[PDB]
Amino acid sequence: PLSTREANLFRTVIRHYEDKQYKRGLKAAEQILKKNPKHGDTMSMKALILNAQGKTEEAFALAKEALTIDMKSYICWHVYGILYRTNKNFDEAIKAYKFALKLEPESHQIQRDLAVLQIQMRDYAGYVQSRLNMLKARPQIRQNWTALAIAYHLEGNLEKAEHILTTYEKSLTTPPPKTDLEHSEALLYKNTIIAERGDIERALQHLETDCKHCLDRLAVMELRASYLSKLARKDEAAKAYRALLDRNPEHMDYYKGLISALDISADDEEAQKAVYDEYAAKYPRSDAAKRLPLNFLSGERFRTTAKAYLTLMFDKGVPSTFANLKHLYSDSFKKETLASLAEEYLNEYVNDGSKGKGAALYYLAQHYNYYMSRDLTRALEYVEKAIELDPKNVDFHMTKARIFKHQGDLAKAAETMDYARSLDPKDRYINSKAAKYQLRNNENEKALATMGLFTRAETAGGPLADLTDMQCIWFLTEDGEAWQRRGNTALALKRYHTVFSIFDTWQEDQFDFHSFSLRKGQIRAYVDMVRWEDRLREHPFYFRAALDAVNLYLSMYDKPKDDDPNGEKLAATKDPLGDAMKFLNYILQFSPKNIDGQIAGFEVYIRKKKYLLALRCLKAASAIDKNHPKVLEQAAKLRKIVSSALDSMAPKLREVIQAELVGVPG
Amino acid sequence: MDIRLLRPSDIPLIQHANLENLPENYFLKYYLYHALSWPQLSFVAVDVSRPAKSPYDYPKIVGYVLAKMEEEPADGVPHGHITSLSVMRTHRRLGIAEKLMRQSQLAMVETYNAHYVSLHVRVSNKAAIHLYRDTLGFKTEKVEAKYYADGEDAYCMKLDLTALREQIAAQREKE
Amino acid sequence: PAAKSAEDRKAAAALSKVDQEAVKNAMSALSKVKVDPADVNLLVEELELSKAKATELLKAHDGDAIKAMKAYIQPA
């Protein structure tokens, strides 16, 4: 090939790259390409430097070109992969990385980078193999052991994952000091693994013997209480929850934990209150210790306690009191009693802000606004009286606006909410609400200007740009739905797609952490993130916008540098059903329990002429709610289509259709 | 309400709470970096009595404290920093900010041997300053002029945790 | 990459940017019925699966296309 003056020039191309001297290296590489113009290795490295200077597009084509010239060159495929890894096409990257390593194994940098893409795409088997190799090369570093343990663990091989962890520990000649954070985290990770195998006996044993003095105190204390209770060592578990109770009086489940350990039946109302009162006395500032007893108390016992609670909160002026008690309104007696008690307190009151009598009225205002005891007329009166007493209270007027909303008069609701904003212009919460109410009244251009009071000023592209940057999903979704209501298909679609793009980003966000978490050693958090990521788009934040998109494409189907700033290309699509699939696939795979998703999936697939997938959607929807009105209609609609077009489609499809179709009642 | 340790799955709704209540916003990726480096330091207030609209509803976040330690110590002396702290307006005056801070300060000392905790504040706030000074016992250390793109000066405020440390060390040794 | 403002947001990018014998032994310790092509082509089209997943699914059910399709559409 190039032989020797060129040989040293290639080397100074690598040196200048590792020294970030791009210009001296291009000119250097160009001296080789003038001598060897079809030298792939030199050409790819030139393709490489361009990408390192935002010429991604040419860069890729050059690398593609370089790889064609020498498909057996390991540099070209590596480069091809590196480009891909920068550009987030992890699938062609994993494939391309694969060929470079196939030409030159043993390369530690490449193997490191292969393992990351592999865990990123959850190729567990690949990741296990990868870490084992890596552990073999540098076994003096604890990280490589934990990493392989992580790999085994995520693969489902808990026994082997525990083995890898324990094997390392047996090599330690001296016990690390209790100040050593890495070791502390490694022990708990092993402990949680013991528990995941379901060996609660052993995990507790290991907890008390080896983990007793770990630095994550909350973790040790909660595991202890959790384990003791499951083992029915109730006295000791009672004691464990008390240590935890003292740390954080505001966490509902700790009281629950304690009460179970004492063997107190939910029917014994007075015996439960004794428990709560002891800590209410011990921790006067715990809200929980005062509030929770209202869940199981009844009759006069409820009234007496509820009054004493209401008096504390009203005197202190707490605005979240209703919101904090409204879950109880499912029970009629507790509902009526609370309203009666507020009224009782009002008359009984003896003598600034909304502290006191106004605050009680606000409970009543919210009471008659709440859908379980709704009386919008009386609510208006109470809120008017509160606002009478305290005209500058933001929360009062905000509730008033919400009442108008319920009367169905959206304009008045947005006007009042916007007024509410004007009383605390420094407070963004009420600002967001005002914007929201304005969007609910289809006043888009106004709402963006409302939000503009808080987005960074000299952002280019105005408020919308900053909110997009800052991943503001609520506004994007609401605005889209608003634009859709007005017939503006283009901007609606653009917004929903942006939410789709925000989630792609969130999924890609974990990329740097596969490596980063090994340095911190904070492994449990790491496995939490992967697992959360494994169910990422089950989040309603995805679901809402995605079902909107799909719904808007369904509508479009029956009624026929930024590359698309007004989302104009979207509305003009020729394949709406095709563009819907990326939204739908995530809906069906991560949110299967939502009949709404399945019904919409069904509609997408019958139109797509894909009658087999339609049935899968139908069978799903029917399994969730047999007598749902939509699934009966669509069920009946499929069988008509099946009996008509069955002669043109293959026999196995007719058979499977007809077989699994009778199940389903239409 | 309901206070518990930060969870990675909370991050989208934490971020959303931040977007609603505070002008300082960050990428989701920045919450991750906190969550994965110092998972023991950040706590949330949760609205638990919220009825669930769907089988996949996540916990509705009405308050949070996001804290970190500086990886590069001032004088080889470990100390925490509050990156962000806020409470929904609908949930104010229940003592929440104070509680979140006390959970966090305690974990900073226990797990990381924090000697103090610090924070920055834009100069026109009041409610917060009474929280940090009057309620939490922060003293003011210096003024940061033009802390960022926005011209408002910032206070750097600091809380000595020496007192918490002896109380903790006396009780850890005695048990 | 290391955007100026906040210093830390730059830093977030930055943070994101010998007793061998027991070990060696520990590490050494650490380590189909012919199928019809047309069936694979039928499933790819009607379930919209990759050829890999369609083949794999068939292989999971001994090349019985009608069995494989019936299994796949059953909900959790």
Author numbering:
A (entry chain A): 4 to 354, 365 to 573, 638 to 743
B (entry chain B): 1 to 175
C (entry chain C): 26 to 42, 57 to 70, 81 to 125
What does the paper say about this structure?
In order to test the role of the HypK N terminus (HypKN), we determined the crystal structure of full-length HypK bound to NatA (Naa15-Naa10ΔC) at 3.1 Å resolution. Crystals belong to the P 32 space group with two heterotrimers in the asymmetric unit. The structure was solved by molecular replacement using the HypK-THB–NatA complex as a search model and was refined to Rwork and Rfree values of 23.0% and 27.1%, respectively. First of all, the Naa10 active site is empty, although crystallization was performed in the presence of CoA, and the Naa15 TPR-N is slightly moved compared to its position in the previous structure. Moreover, two additional pieces of electron density are present on the surface of NatA. These could be attributed to the N terminus of HypK comprising two α helices as predicted by the PSIPRED algorithm. While one of them locates in close proximity to the Naa10 substrate-binding site, the other one occupies a groove formed by Naa15 helices α8–10. Helix α1 was positioned in the remaining density close to the active site, while the connecting loops (residues 43–56 and 71–80) are disordered. HypK helix α1 comprises five hydrophobic residues (Ala36 to Leu40), which bind to a hydrophobic surface and might limit access to the Naa10 active site.
